[PDB]
Design a protein around this ligand. Structure first.
Ligand SMILES: CS(=O)(=O)N(Cc1ccco1)C[C@@H](O)Cn1c2ccccc2c2ccccc21
Length: 492
């Protein structure tokens, strides 16, 4: 075979069954990522996401070099480029990791027709998720589970997730390496941010370095004693948790730099070491399982990220409020907790889950009454771990738009922050114009006596904006609106 392995997610060598399929019996293997650099033509994506991808690609290329090969980065779009690629390279097999996401599936079906037309074999393997999602759906009467509880019931009756696949052999690769030309970089090289047209003046090291090598190091650290105890054995929220963690895995999971199956098993194995003669609870895997739940929900729903025409979504008459949406996106709400979180997100590409809940509540049902759809869009742009399934699903969950929500109240834009970080140091860090404020006022600086504002060297409404809404009034009206909306839902 002359094989091509197409990277999309699954940006790793480890736990890559599709790659193994490409390699077996091949005369030549080429690994490709098809990159569309025409930014203007597509929804905006932030620098943090682009950089993470490029770094992930650099890492793969680096790893491939160890196998005497290279990454082929091909510029363009897949449907546009594949037919030429098949001819020019004489490909007989194409492999990739399966994509459950509805747009992804659609794209993939089209490529599969093209491949057939060209007499190219296609092998796909599901390694993005723990389980075979279609199986979960099948067991459920051919519809996705719409509660986490039902979802847990379904997997509970199922076989365990497959173990991570064996690594590709160095020698297996070497038996099939492709001719690398010495002009390779010009045509197939991994671009730099500068090259793609991003401004890099004064851009320091990424908070979340891309790639498989980083991801593997993080996993090992994640399972060392200190992280294990804090994460799993005795977990409690604290202010320091707000900060990006050297053991955070979520971006790596999103990009496929880290296998979910590897994480799941490494975690189980650690649990067994720690805990004698017990089987773990499902909650041990909760971060993964919530991810699976949303993927399962998404896969058959092309309208998943939309309100109107989405079968699982409550129809709610959201405000169109462009100015408000803009202030939220830019961290200029005048609520320092909300502003600080939005600042961290824009700057770094990750925020804590509780932080996401806070800003999402504020945008939607809590304060602004703007559609969750707008929130999804912003997160899509800025948030490293925000894919189609998890992002939309979470937003709909939070906003009480889907997944059967026996209500819980929205977080207070002031109280929650103060509770989460009483010191106020998180605010001081991300909104240093407010660093002067004492802790008692840093979350609600508008309430500070004028002498306080002056000592702080920050006059509210001059050096930092006033709060854009009155929370107590707004929340009261909103809570009533939500109650009315539920009341007006047909009961059965
Ligand atoms: C539903 S849950 O019980 O609270 N839990 C589900 C989960 C755990 C791991 C993956 O999902 C936390 C998520 O909701 C946190 N989260 C996101 C996680 C990834 C991408 C976007 C978001 C997002 C957007 C808005 C509000 C919260 C958000």
């Amino acid at each position: 075979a002359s094989s091509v392995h197409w990277f999309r997610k699954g940006l790793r060598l480890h736990d890559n069954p599709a790659l193994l399929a490409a390699v077996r019996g091949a005369r030549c293997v080429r690994c490709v990522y098809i990159l569309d650099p025409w930014f203007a033509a597509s929804s905006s994506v932030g620098i943090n996401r682009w950089r993470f991808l490029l770094q992930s690609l650099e890492d793969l290329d680096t790893s491939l070099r160890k196998l005497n090969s290279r990454l082929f980065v091909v510029r363009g779009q897949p449907a546009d480029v594949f037919p030429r690629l098949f001819k020019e390279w004489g490909v007989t097999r194409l492999t990739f990791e399966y994509d459950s996401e509805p747009f992804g599936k659609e794209r993939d079906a089209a490529i599969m027709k093209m491949a057939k037309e060209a007499g190219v074999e296609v092998v796909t393997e599901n390694s993005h998720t723990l389980y075979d999602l279609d199986r979960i759906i099948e067991l459920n009467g051919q519809k996705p589970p719409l509660t986490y509880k039902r979802f847990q019931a379904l997997i509970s009756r199922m076989e365990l997730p497959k173990k991570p696949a064996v690594a590709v052999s160095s020698q297996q690769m070497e038996s099939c390496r492709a001719e690398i030309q010495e002009n390779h970089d010009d045509t197939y090289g991994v671009p730099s941010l500068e090259e793609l047209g991003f401004p890099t003046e004064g851009l320091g090291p990424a908070v979340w370095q891309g790639g498989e090598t980083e991801a593997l190091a993080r996993l090992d650290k994640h399972l060392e004693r200190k992280a294990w105890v804090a994460n799993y054995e005795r977990p409690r929220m604290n202010a320091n948790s707000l900060l990006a963690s050297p053991t955070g895995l979520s971006p790596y999971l999103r990009f496929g730099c880290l296998s979910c199956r590897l994480f799941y098993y490494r975690l189980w194995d650690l649990y067994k070491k720690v805990k004698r003669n017990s089987t773990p609870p499902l909650s041990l895997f909760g971060q993964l399982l919530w991810r699976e739940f949303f993927y399962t929900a998404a896969t058959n729903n092309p309208r998943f990220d939309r309100m109107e025409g989405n079968p699982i979504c409550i129809q709610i008459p959201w405000d169109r409020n462009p100015e408000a949406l803009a202030k939220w996106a830019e961290g200029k709400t005048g609520f320092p907790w909300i502003d600080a979180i939005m600042t961290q997100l824009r700057q770094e590409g990750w925020i804590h889950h509780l932080a996401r809940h806070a800003v999402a509540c504020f945008l939607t049902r809590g304060d602004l009454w703007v559609s969750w759809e707008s929130g999804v869009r912003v997160f899509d742009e800025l948030l490293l771990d925000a894919d189609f399934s998890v992002n939309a699903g979470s937003w709909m969950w939070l906003s009480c738009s889907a997944f059967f929500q026996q209500f819980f109240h929205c977080y207070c834009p002031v109280g929650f922050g103060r509770r989460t970080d009483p010191s106020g140091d998180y605010i001081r860090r991300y909104l240093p114009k407010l660093k002067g404020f004492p802790s008692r006022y840093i979350y609600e600086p508008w309430n500070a006596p004028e002498s306080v504002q002056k000592a702080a060297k920050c006059i509210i409404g001059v050096d930092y904006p006033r709060p854009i809404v009155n929370h107590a009034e707004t929340s009261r009206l909103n809570i009533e609106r939500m109650k009315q909306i539920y009341q007006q839902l047909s009961r059965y």
